[PDB]
Design a protein around this ligand. Sequence first.
Ligand SMILES: CC(=O)N[C@@H]1[C@@H](O)[C@H](O[C@@H]2O[C@H](CO[C@]3(C(=O)O)C[C@H](O)[C@@H](NC(C)=O)[C@H]([C@H](O)[C@H](O)CO)O3)[C@H](O)[C@H](O)[C@H]2O)[C@@H](CO)O[C@H]1O
Ligand SMILES: CC(=O)N[C@@H]1[C@@H](O)[C@H](O[C@@H]2O[C@H](CO[C@]3(C(=O)O)C[C@H](O)[C@@H](NC(C)=O)[C@H]([C@H](O)[C@H](O)CO)O3)[C@H](O)[C@H](O)[C@H]2O)[C@@H](CO)O[C@H]1O
Ligand SMILES: CC(=O)N[C@@H]1[C@@H](O)[C@H](O[C@@H]2O[C@H](CO[C@]3(C(=O)O)C[C@H](O)[C@@H](NC(C)=O)[C@H]([C@H](O)[C@H](O)CO)O3)[C@H](O)[C@H](O)[C@H]2O)[C@@H](CO)O[C@H]1O
Ligand SMILES: *[C@@H]1O[C@H](CO)[C@@H](O[C@@H]2O[C@H](CO)[C@@H](O[C@@H]3O[C@H](CO)[C@@H](O)[C@H](O)[C@@H]3O)[C@H](O)[C@H]2NC(C)=O)[C@H](O)[C@H]1NC(C)=O
Ligand SMILES: *[C@@H]1O[C@H](CO)[C@@H](O)[C@H](O)[C@H]1NC(C)=O
Ligand SMILES: *[C@@H]1O[C@H](CO)[C@@H](O)[C@H](O)[C@H]1NC(C)=O
Ligand SMILES: *[C@@H]1O[C@H](CO)[C@@H](O)[C@H](O)[C@H]1NC(C)=O
Lengths: 321, 321, 321, 164, 164, 164
Amino acid sequence: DTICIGYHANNSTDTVDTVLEKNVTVTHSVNLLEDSHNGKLCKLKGIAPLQLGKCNIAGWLLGNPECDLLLTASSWSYIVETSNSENGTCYPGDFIDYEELREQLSSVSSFEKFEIFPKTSSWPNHETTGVTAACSYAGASSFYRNLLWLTKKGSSYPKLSKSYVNNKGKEVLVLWGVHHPPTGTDQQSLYQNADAYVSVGSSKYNRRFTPEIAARPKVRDLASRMNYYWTLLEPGDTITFEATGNLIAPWYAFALNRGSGSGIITSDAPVHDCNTKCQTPHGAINSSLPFQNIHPVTIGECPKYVRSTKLRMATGLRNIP
Amino acid sequence: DTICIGYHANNSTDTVDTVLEKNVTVTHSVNLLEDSHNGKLCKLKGIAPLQLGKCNIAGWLLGNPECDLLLTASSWSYIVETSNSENGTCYPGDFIDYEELREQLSSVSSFEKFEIFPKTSSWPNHETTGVTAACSYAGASSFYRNLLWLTKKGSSYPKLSKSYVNNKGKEVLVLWGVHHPPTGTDQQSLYQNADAYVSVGSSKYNRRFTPEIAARPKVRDLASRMNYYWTLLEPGDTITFEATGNLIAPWYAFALNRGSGSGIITSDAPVHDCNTKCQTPHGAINSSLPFQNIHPVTIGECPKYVRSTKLRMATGLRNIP
Amino acid sequence: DTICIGYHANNSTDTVDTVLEKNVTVTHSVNLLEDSHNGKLCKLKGIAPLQLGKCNIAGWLLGNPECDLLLTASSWSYIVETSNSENGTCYPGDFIDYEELREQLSSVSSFEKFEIFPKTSSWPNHETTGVTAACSYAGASSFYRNLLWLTKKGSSYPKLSKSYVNNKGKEVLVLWGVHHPPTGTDQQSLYQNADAYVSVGSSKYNRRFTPEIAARPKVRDLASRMNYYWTLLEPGDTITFEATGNLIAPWYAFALNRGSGSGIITSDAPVHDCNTKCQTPHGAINSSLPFQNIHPVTIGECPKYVRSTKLRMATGLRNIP
Amino acid sequence: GLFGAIAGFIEGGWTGMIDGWYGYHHQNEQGSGYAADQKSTQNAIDGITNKVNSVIEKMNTQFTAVGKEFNNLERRIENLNKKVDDGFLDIWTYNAELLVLLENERTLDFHDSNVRNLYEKVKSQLKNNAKEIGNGCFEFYHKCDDACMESVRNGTYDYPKYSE
Amino acid sequence: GLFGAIAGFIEGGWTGMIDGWYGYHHQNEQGSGYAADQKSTQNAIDGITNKVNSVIEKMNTQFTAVGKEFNNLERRIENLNKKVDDGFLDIWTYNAELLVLLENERTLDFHDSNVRNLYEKVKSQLKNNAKEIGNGCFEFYHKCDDACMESVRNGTYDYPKYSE
Amino acid sequence: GLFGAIAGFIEGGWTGMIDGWYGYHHQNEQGSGYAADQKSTQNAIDGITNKVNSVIEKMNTQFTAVGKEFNNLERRIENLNKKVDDGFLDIWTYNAELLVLLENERTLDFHDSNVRNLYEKVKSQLKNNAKEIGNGCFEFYHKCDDACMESVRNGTYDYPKYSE
Ligand SMILES: CC(=O)N[C@@H]1[C@@H](O)[C@H](O[C@@H]2O[C@H](CO[C@]3(C(=O)O)C[C@H](O)[C@@H](NC(C)=O)[C@H]([C@H](O)[C@H](O)CO)O3)[C@H](O)[C@H](O)[C@H]2O)[C@@H](CO)O[C@H]1O
Ligand SMILES: CC(=O)N[C@@H]1[C@@H](O)[C@H](O[C@@H]2O[C@H](CO[C@]3(C(=O)O)C[C@H](O)[C@@H](NC(C)=O)[C@H]([C@H](O)[C@H](O)CO)O3)[C@H](O)[C@H](O)[C@H]2O)[C@@H](CO)O[C@H]1O
Ligand SMILES: CC(=O)N[C@@H]1[C@@H](O)[C@H](O[C@@H]2O[C@H](CO[C@]3(C(=O)O)C[C@H](O)[C@@H](NC(C)=O)[C@H]([C@H](O)[C@H](O)CO)O3)[C@H](O)[C@H](O)[C@H]2O)[C@@H](CO)O[C@H]1O
Ligand SMILES: *[C@@H]1O[C@H](CO)[C@@H](O[C@@H]2O[C@H](CO)[C@@H](O[C@@H]3O[C@H](CO)[C@@H](O)[C@H](O)[C@@H]3O)[C@H](O)[C@H]2NC(C)=O)[C@H](O)[C@H]1NC(C)=O
Ligand SMILES: *[C@@H]1O[C@H](CO)[C@@H](O)[C@H](O)[C@H]1NC(C)=O
Ligand SMILES: *[C@@H]1O[C@H](CO)[C@@H](O)[C@H](O)[C@H]1NC(C)=O
Ligand SMILES: *[C@@H]1O[C@H](CO)[C@@H](O)[C@H](O)[C@H]1NC(C)=O
């Protein structure tokens, strides 16, 4: 009797927006917006992030005594800090170009700590035993594990000269410090020489330091200050330390091969053995879709961040059951 | 007997552009582009901007004698400078991290000037009377209102130590200066000590200054120079000044709560009691439309700047009377 | 009898992509993507680029002996360095604010090199002949052409004082250097004065330099270092040099009017006489189309760079022969 | 016109019709006049209103101070800052210009479609009871008064009554 | 509807047809049932699949660390950095919102077009051998069995055979 | 095709017609040949020309040096700079790729629409003086000579003349 032309309908409650009409019910649709995450900090490109425990990057690099090493990994795809990374420079002072260093260490494919200037054999003419209550471990005065405090031996502080040649076949991160006594008497008590200087040089690096002696508000019960410096020593190059005083000497340094393009995430979300191509501070997200509203600051190959709560694309047609 | 299907027409001369055809006359249309302004500098977030009159920010903070002091409101949403703000540092020299400071003051609540080191009681062992013809007021040699020039009293300049503890419950902006004589003789005549230094420190801030003595051209008839420094002292923290010479000491300082996300406008447009969500150097504009061609550099919640002279959207249809 | 309605067809194999279907063959199409370049470095704004040959910008400014045969125009729209620009600072050390200077010289409209402190009349009591094997030319020890190495004449290095007043009616770029011997013996051997200083001042510039004497890894067989400084001297201003040693003195300086908005191109492509609105390191490109896949780094008024290999716009219709 | 009605087989608009975008002109013994179809007009107004509001409201903004101040040793980051502002300028200008061009085309097409749909809606219900002239009018084969004309406009038109 | 079929002269959809987007319902003395048109349905699916894939796959992604750290003397470049992220945020939010709004409209239009094309495709071959009611149906003036119905759905329907 | 003519009920194009995009093929006793419709072709050419020019000319930029140089203690602002260049690159690549996809679709739709509009205009004036095959042709029921053929193309075709 009759044949009829028509179209599909179903029980779908899916809605989309169109330029002419809001909230149109369609038979089929797809989501273009990634609105969920797994609540975890995951491995990026198959590689776990660096976890610092109780310490921030400065505390970790300088060897703050509160940083117990789990034999920290030899590589990381990015770095995680938490609300618990408290233990920094325990001796008060400035860490120079600290943000630059954090950025340049954000990813590495190889990382090793090694003893650059062995405590026992390196300083025959100087005292190595200096400690402070400001850096304490197990209820006793102590010092950074990766640096050595050089003071005068027997009323004398001769001019020291110490060089390291980088045969590691990769960059060596060398950190050191310069101590600034509160008074002239203390300067003399420690280094003997009021005129003391510190000189550090390589092929690409040249800098001279002199003691700044001043009384200053006590921080961790210290009116003195200790400033921290670093350089990345290129493979094959040499670094030379020369000092008549105030040098807080490298003990351990770090040989490493830098990656690039990574960064630091600050989050208390738990680190897991999961894998992601895109990490956010809230958690990892799937990277398949073009847009995500989870977080603007991300690391990985990530969907573009948008404020949209809903982006839904009609595939099927108007649903009219 | 007939019935006809047809469409609307009117006397509208409104024209729009289409991808297929230019200059199509339509019955109705709406404007997407904000091309006008009110020629005024208005309040942002319900608050008037800071106006500095004859002075720039440096002159105001330091208390250049030509600038009207104490007149600052306790809050502002942004800062206005004019073609007439000429009065800066009347004593020639460098204002260090000046742009940073301007940025940090761009919006503030709870702003107050106060006397951090009262002239009469703070320095019994040094002369406070130093002035210069370079900063003149009322036909007499004078100086910055917020700083003090400390020189030796009776051939001697003893070691000074002065501390301020911040009990104000908000940030304290402390400004000071370091004087740089042209010659060694001037150095001795003023401060007695050739080896003189200035040290300034707090919990988070440590810096040492020494005079840099060099022959150099007269500026505002002065061969000497004076450099200006500042820091933000946190609530509860202490700042300590130590000097054997050359310190241009804080007299007045500033307590404040910094805002964020604001900026500085340079314009000669008059300030009024009007309110706007978007301020431009030419004047305020409505923020309702998505685009504006008035000016690329704005402060507020603003339409996107475009080069377009015309963006007009067809609503009604082709007008064919 | 019959009449038929139909559409055009041809042998055109041109294909385009559409949102519904890939690789549609159409009768007519136009290219929106600039996919070709001319393989030449051309003039921008009617003006040729500066080409430095064997030298980088540092070598050119300092007058590295390998840069003598360069012929510099009085103006350039941008600067070209090549893979062959190796000849820099041959005496090892730091060039201060080097990236900034390169940026600010990227375009210039009136450039003249002139003799700021004539070699013959300026230094009667100091030796001007100092050279080094590190700056060797044609196998013989040499030095920068635009600076003079001042050493002691006979047994003494008296205090020198030299001022230059800028009568050029434009900015004058002044470069100098400060030498840092490895040992006190060398310091004494060159300048005799262990306590030596260098002082430089102008209306905007105030600095005193002292030699930093330290042993350092050898670069080009030199354990010493030489640092390079510069300033733009405003019209009418004066710059004054005073030294008891270690000054590498200005010989030639540069009067110029800085342009703006340009930059530096690194390319091995030949410079030719031709004009473009858009220059890339691979070559000049047509600026007519909105997009280009030639190179991400451009100078000019340029099509937007895209990763697209193909952007082809259908003009005609579906081709169905 | 994409749908071939406006400036199509219907060549011009009616200044006589003030109450809507689309509508009817009727002439019978009882009189004449223009009457706008409110259903198709109000839907068109709703659609276009939504489009305009979408273009305006979808724009999201935060409080921003665009300007930055740099000293004479900061030229590189000053120009970085300028590159940002200029890049945004190129993007927003291009997208705004093209968005308006493209959507104006679609808006006019939309009206062209609505007229045609209305025309075919009336033509469908009248069937052979009237003849189609081709200018968008229909000559009736029967008598249609103001009550009958309203039935066509209302979509309630009764075909079998007038079957003639 | 732009093409006037969906929610058009065809007022509603069929929950009864589960195997496709567009299709046929036939009723004769021999029985009734729904049948989806396989040609037009798969063509639409191919097209929409390409559109969705285009929107998703044209997006380019490289490894990027968005975050940056600045100290308390770096406020200016910190806010410059923020201006970049927020500017990109404004651009992508706006373009994504409008792209979805605009293309959802076009997708619905596409379906409306496909239905109308099918309707007129069947109407073309049937000619006067059937009666057009409205509503998307056709009353045959002859007897059409399941073999005849299948010829209509394939478009192989034989007109000269049924006279009348 | 959205409008269903091109690759629609009109199945293929004419290599024989060299003088336009759309046109006519006529067969009578006096002869046969192709003739392009100048009105619809020229309107389309004007429109597409405007579209292409719009996409090209709306792009405006200032003199810019993209490259920047940073030292090894400037890594952060170097990567900021890189984020800017790469962000602009992502935006322009995505928008350009989609702009071409979307507008190519519309251009083909535009041509498809023009053919149908032309087809229905001829069908409108011919009415029952010719029979509609469904392949895009019309068999005349009367004599159509070159003067008659031209009247159809010119839109001046007179129906009552040929009721025969
Ligand atoms: C050089 C010296 O011993 N000076 C004595 C003052 O330090 C001392 O004043 C008090 O010192 C307290 C800090 O003491 C230590 C510490 O940091 O724990 C003791 C450490 O053994 C010592 N380390 C070394 C290698 O000598 C360390 C060091 O002197 C400073 O860190 C150098 O700046 O000091 C605490 O800060 C008190 O607030 C401070 O007043 C006085 C009084 O006992 O005697 C001085 O001889
Ligand atoms: C230390 C001193 O008195 N030096 C004398 C030179 O100043 C003087 O050179 C003349 O100095 C003129 C400026 O004199 C003042 C000023 O700034 O107006 C006078 C002020 O009382 C004095 N202030 C203080 C606290 O001492 C001020 C100060 O010394 C300098 O500004 C600091 O450098 O100097 C002016 O520049 C003339 O152009 C200049 O010739 C010479 C010659 O008379 O004698 C020096 O003893
Ligand atoms: C002043 C002088 O001649 N001093 C002698 C030292 O130069 C020499 O140390 C050796 O110097 C080697 C390089 O010497 C040159 C050079 O080519 O750079 C020779 C130049 O004539 C000399 N230039 C000037 C103006 O005097 C130059 C200069 O002294 C250095 O640049 C110093 O900064 O040195 C090479 O570096 C060797 O490694 C180094 O040992 C010692 C040898 O004991 O004798 C000194 O008299
Ligand atoms: C590593 O970080 C921890 C903090 O999580 C440090 O432990 C404690 O830090 C608090 C500050 O929140 C110190 O408080 C101070 O205590 C002294 C007396 O104990 C008092 O005089 C001060 O006014 C203030 O209240 C606390 O001393 C400190 N505890 C210890 C055992 O030092 C820890 O010091 C950090 N360690 C290193 C090596 O950085
Ligand atoms: C990403 O992994 C798969 C593949 O897209 C998907 O099923 C999953 O839901 C995504 N991850 C999350 C957390 O949604
Ligand atoms: C700025 O103030 C100084 C004195 O403090 C005065 O010499 C100068 O004239 C003032 N500015 C102008 C433009 O006059
Ligand atoms: C912006 O201008 C006024 C604000 O005074 C507002 O009423 C108006 O609606 C806005 N402009 C447009 C085009 O909406």
